[PDB]
């Protein structure tokens, strides 16, 4: 394990902060978003690639002790390093149909809802810093920095 005693202690203290129903554990459906909130950002698929069960009775029923959660978090902490600022800026540069930073909200909504795993009509509203009127014009450069800091 790569984590120090202080880091493991910090993870325990963080694990204790969640308003769980006294399970003393963490649900397999929830643990992905816990790991996201507390540190590195895995994909929806990665939560299975860490050798968590890809099929089950229910992901809300499946649940893990800290002893099982810690290595699951450690492996992505070590092996799931996210892209560079240059990489995300390049991605958005290739995406941007206006080729000037000022992307259209409808196109952003398309590449989050339609492509990949479907991001919800509640998520997108909390992600988009601007608004989607008849213009829909928003600058991606702010958004890339926002998610880089996330």
Partner 1 sequence: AVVASSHKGKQGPSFSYGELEKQLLQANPILEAFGNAKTVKN
Query: Does 51 participate in binding partner 1 (rule CB under 8 A)?
Result: no
Phi, psi of 102 (to 5 degrees): -85, 80
Kindly state the smallest distance separating residue 133's Cβ from partner 1, in Å.
8
134 touching partner 1, by CB under 8 A: yes
Give the helix, strand, coil percentages of the chain, each rounded to 5. 50, 5, 45
**Using CA atoms, how far apart are residues 143 and 96, in angstroms rounded to an integer?**
13
16 is a contact residue toward partner 1 (CB under 8 A): no
Q: Minimum Å distance from CB 109 to partner 1? A: 9
How far the first Cα of the chain sits from its last, in Å, is 24
Which tokens go with 105?
Answer: 């909200």
According to CB under 8 A, which one of 106, 115, 117, 149 is a site residue for partner 1? Answer: 106
- Residue 114 touching partner 1 (CB under 8 A): no
Closest approach, Cβ 135 to partner 1, in A, equals 10
Closest residue by Cα to residue 113 from 133, 127, 101: 127
97 binds partner 1 (CB under 8 A): no
Chain residues binding partner 1 by CB under 8 A are 106, 133-134
């Amino acid at each position: 394990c790569d984590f120090s005693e202080e880091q493991t202690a910090e993870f325990k203290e963080a694990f204790q902060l969640f308003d769980r129903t006294g399970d003393g554990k963490i649900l397999y459906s929830q643990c992905g978003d816990v790991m996201r909130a507390l540190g590195q950002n895995p994909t929806n698929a990665e939560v299975m690639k860490v050798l968590g069960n890809p099929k089950s009775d229910e992901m809300n029923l499946k649940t893990l002790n800290f002893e099982q959660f810690l290595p699951m978090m450690q492996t992505i902490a070590k092996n799931k390093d996210q892209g560079c600022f240059e990489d995300y800026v390049e991605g958005l540069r290739v995406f941007d149909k206006e080729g000037n930073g000022t992307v259209m909200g409808a196109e952003i909504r398309h590449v989050l809802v339609t492509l990949g795993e479907k991001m919800t009509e509640e998520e997108v509203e909390q992600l988009v810093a601007g608004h989607e009127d008849s213009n829909g014009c928003i600058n991606y450069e702010e958004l890339v920095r926002m998610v880089l800091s996330g």
